[PDB]
């Protein structure tokens, strides 16, 4: 349907534009883990508890 058209046309067009040229960094790109300096910004804590069920 067209209940999500507004965002769909944005996401589709933004993708086209964002790919007009082969992005500077390919999808197979991988910064050598040897060169990894920091770990960016800490992620938010999930309020869900983790466990292992069987």
């Amino acid at each position: 349907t067209s209940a999500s058209g507004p965002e769909h046309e944005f996401v589709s067009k933004f993708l086209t534009l964002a790919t007009l040229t082969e992005p500077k960094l390919p999808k197979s790109y991988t910064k050598p883990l040897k060169d990894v300096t920091n770990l960016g910004v800490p992620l938010p804590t999930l309020k869900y508890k983790y466990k292992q069920n069987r």
Binding site: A3, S4, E7, H8, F10, V11, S12, F14, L15, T16, L17, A18, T19, L20, P23, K24, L25, P26, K27, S28, Y29, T30, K31, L33, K34, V36, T37, N38, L39, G40, V41, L43, P44, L46, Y48, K49, Y50, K51, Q52
Partner: protein, 291 residues
Amino acid sequence: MGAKLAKTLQRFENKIKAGDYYEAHQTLRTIANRYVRSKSYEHAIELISQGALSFLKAKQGGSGTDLIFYLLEVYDLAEVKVDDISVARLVRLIAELDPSEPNLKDVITGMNNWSIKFSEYKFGDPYLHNTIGSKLLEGDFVYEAERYFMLGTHDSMIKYVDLLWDWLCQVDDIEDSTVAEFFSRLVFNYLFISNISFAHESKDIFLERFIEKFHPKYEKIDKNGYEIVFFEDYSDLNFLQLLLITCQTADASYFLNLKNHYLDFSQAYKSELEFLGQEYFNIVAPKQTNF
């Protein structure tokens, strides 16, 4: 020397299967200390490691844990460099460790610290992390496992997607923003260490499971080789997917336009976007709070 070591190793594991734990532990250490005193590290390493293995296999965390530390001490005393062999010994010992061992984390830390000091990895050897991650997860230490997997190998990436997927499923009351809280971790973490390959693969595996379980309304958008699974009920996931590709272009304009269209998301991931804008768009100006 080689024929003597092998022999005693049986009379040791004989004292272990007999119950004589104290005897087995005391004797081995003193003897091992002797090899170390004469700088015959290599010999001590095999003896100590072997002794630790048997102890752990006999459910004797106490002795097993102790020996691991002792081994590490030698590792640093012999300046053992990080390589397959060096890592292997630790991996083999980590496998026999009890997920509930009161020392678990300490053991893990020690091993990793060693890898850091004798390798070019600021956070430790990748392969090693793959094993460490699994061990931590067995003791329900999710957050610790996540970090190691993040800095692990390809298998870790799979076990990281399983760690996040089994967590998302554990949620009784799922919501539109709930799926993003898990999925976003994959995109952000991998984008920080600039591992686009893992970021794309982890994304594909996680987005496909999400589609085969929740059956959300979507439609794949393809453009110039790239694809964006447009979810009709998950804007957070759409934004996150665009963010990934955007960073790949390293073009300031695209990054700014994406954020200006998703003002709300631009404030939820304020700090995260600030970093990404510095690592992929050379932005020094802080992130102005939208709300």
